[model samples]
Target: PATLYAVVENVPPLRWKEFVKRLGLSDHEIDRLELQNGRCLREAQYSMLATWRRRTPRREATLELLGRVLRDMDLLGCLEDIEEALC
Candidate 1:
């Protein structure tokens, strides 16, 4: 029921900074997204995901990686929400 992008889209805006950070977006990288999308945090977040996806090998881009990021960020609730989305 949910794809990577789907789960990412549902993630709260307040959680995005840490989410992207944990996924490998540099502070300066995020700063640029913020600069370009001052009006929409969602735009920045999607871009951040795309950035990581672009650089990551397809085999390395998996739910396990994303879930681990959420876990490391102390956002297991976010992972649970993604599970809900799947159901």
Candidate 2:
């Protein structure tokens, strides 16, 4: 199951840590969010994360997850399905 998490704006580690603390997440969960190997499951993970993002009160974690997913999926083949659909 997916967990609800928050993301902080692009900031230094101190500010970022403060933001996480504000959200009431433990240091361990924060580390999981920041350093998780979701790239291997980018599409599925992003889809799951999006589901939580839509109804959640926070936008930071979902936004960051999206950024990561986009970066990992950035390749010519990544757009192949979309290109074909558009054709």
Candidate 3:
């Protein structure tokens, strides 16, 4: 079951707010996750991933798009961490 969502969850929370933003979430949506999670960074970000995947091509999750997002966010180095987390 470990896949794109897995990758997203594994992404370090260094810049998760920016990550969600880069993933195309609106300000209000981002604000809601934080509010819902009581400011728990990882939980907020995991929910953010859920929403992003839910909207993509009618709920398609693509590593291709996520990869470029990681690269652009200067989070390209997290790929190894993602894989290891899945393991």
Candidate 4:
């Protein structure tokens, strides 16, 4: 039987913690997000974080900005597929 718990256990971590951290999430905020075993953010969550970053104007690179733009346009899944293809 394909159990939900089994599926979650078999899947690899998407390193979303690292991503959110790089996006400037505080430890407390990250903890609140409760991303245990989560592979990615919901589109709204990603957009909200990206928007906050843009308004704050941090030291993010062009590529990072491009990734956020892609996310905003709902192409983040496609971008991930492309990244996986490259890998």
Candidate 5:
């Protein structure tokens, strides 16, 4: 399974931290992911995707990974809002 958690694992720690902040994660959730399980809550991942989908211009690398994860998870509709944002 191409879990969102697994895809994010490929992101560098610094990048992940920045991405998490960009995803609107609270400090406590960030700390839990960084210091405990290294996995985001499912709701967090869903919210992150929702947030990304609302953006007019998304980061290429991030969008690519998100697209793959969404596709793999059969959540393609979530990508519809920002399909053009992908490069």
Candidate 6:
């Protein structure tokens, strides 16, 4: 299934670039996707759709991937905040 993605924040161009690269996306793909979206969006917005896409009988692969990304980046506070929000 094609995963749903969204961006809720209008991140500054430079930080947006960093985020895309941090997510292991190439500049070209980032540009393409951003262009397709028409603008940058916040993480939470993107994750809302991503959460749905991750739904499965046994598990959520999309959320798992996001967890890996957050863990790899050592975003402890971010994870905590997300957990609180999810709760």
* TM of each candidate vs. truth: 0.66, 0.28, 0.66, 0.32, 0.34, 0.50
Query: Where does candidate 3 stray beyond 4 Å?
Result: 4-10, 55-58, 83-87
Q: Model 5 segments beyond 4 Å from truth?
A: 1-6, 38-87
lDDT of 2: 0.39
Candidate 2: residue 33 lDDT (0-100): 53
Instruction: Give per-residue CA lDDT, model 6, range 8-84, as digits (tens).
Output: 22223345456545555445655555444544354433533342354323265554554455566675455555555
Between candidates 4 and 6, the lDDT winner: 6
Q: What digit string (tens of lDDT, one per residue) describes model 4 on residues 1-87?
A: 112122122222265445445545465666655443234544324433544455556565533443564475554665565445435
Q: lDDT values of the candidates?
A: 0.68, 0.39, 0.64, 0.44, 0.48, 0.45
At residue 54, candidate 3 shows an lDDT of: 66
Which candidate number has the best TM-score?
A: 1
Give the clashing residue pairs of candidate 5, or none.
none
- Please provide, for model 2 over 1-87, each residue's C-alpha lDDT reduced to its tens digit, 9 standing for 90 to 100: 122221111222344444444434445654565455545434323333443465456646554443444344342342343234335
lDDT tens string, model 3, 1-87?
255556656566767777666776676878777677756665666666666666556344455566677888776677556656567
The lowest-lDDT stretch of 10 consecutive residues in candidate 1 is: 1-10
- Model 3 TM-score relative to the real fold: 0.66
User: Model 4: number of clashes?
Assistant: 0
All candidates: CA RMSD (Å)? 2.9, 11.4, 3.0, 11.3, 10.5, 6.3
TM-score of 4: 0.32
Which has the higher lDDT value, candidate number 3 or candidate number 4? 3
Full-model lDDT, candidate 4: 0.44
lDDT-better candidate, 2 vs 6: 6
Clashing pairs in 1: none
